[PDB]
């Protein structure tokens, strides 16, 4: 029975990773406003961070915001297995990563620039504007954008 009051412990919009996280939506889903974090990740980040899930974003301490922010830096340290991660075994680095925030279009643009610089097919596709995977263009993808 979470019929709970508080007086100032709640606060709408708390900024995380230079993003804008709504305080009225449940934690797990509140955090997903950020690029790079889906519902799978945010369900797991908040588990290791000793955070009560029944809460809304607006609640939770700024040390509980600190636990979650930090775990997202390195999930690989808080017992979060690599197959949960969105940049594993980098092409130019060889380690595991989970890119976040502004850094999503970052390494993504890079990758595309990688098979643009090397001038390969899947990149040439990207460049041209057309599709990258072997699907048909005869009949589909029309109306553009």
């Amino acid at each position: 029975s979470l019929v709970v009051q508080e007086q100032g412990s709640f606060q709408h919009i708390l900024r995380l990773l230079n993003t804008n996280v709504d305080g009225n939506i449940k934690i797990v889903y509140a955090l997903t406003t950020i690029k790079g974090v889906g519902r799978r990740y945010s369900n797991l980040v908040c588990k290791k961070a000793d955070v009560d899930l029944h809460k809304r974003a607006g609640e939770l301490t700024q040390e509980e915001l600190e636990r979650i922010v930090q775990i997202m830096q390195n999930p690989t340290h808080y017992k979060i297995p690599a197959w949960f991660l969105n940049r594993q075994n980098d092409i130019t680095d060889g380690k595991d990563y989970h890119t976040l925030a502004n850094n999503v279009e970052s390494k993504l643009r890079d990758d595309l620039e990688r098979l643009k610089k090397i001038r390969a097919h899947r990149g040439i596709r990207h460049f041209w504007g057309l599709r990258v995977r072997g699907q048909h263009t005869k009949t589909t993808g029309r109306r553009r954008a």
Binding site: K116, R119, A120, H121, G123, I124, F127, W128, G129, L130, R144
Partner: peptide
């Protein structure tokens, strides 16, 4: 090869989308 490909202008998607569609693409009757 690809060097000519990626570096070719007048051959992208803009240059295609710019173009008007042939008026014989909704026509039959043989």
């Amino acid at each position: 090869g690809n060097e000519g490909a990626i570096r070719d202008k007048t051959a992208g998607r803009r240059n295609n989308r710019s173009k008007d569609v042939t008026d014989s693409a909704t026509t039959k009757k043989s």
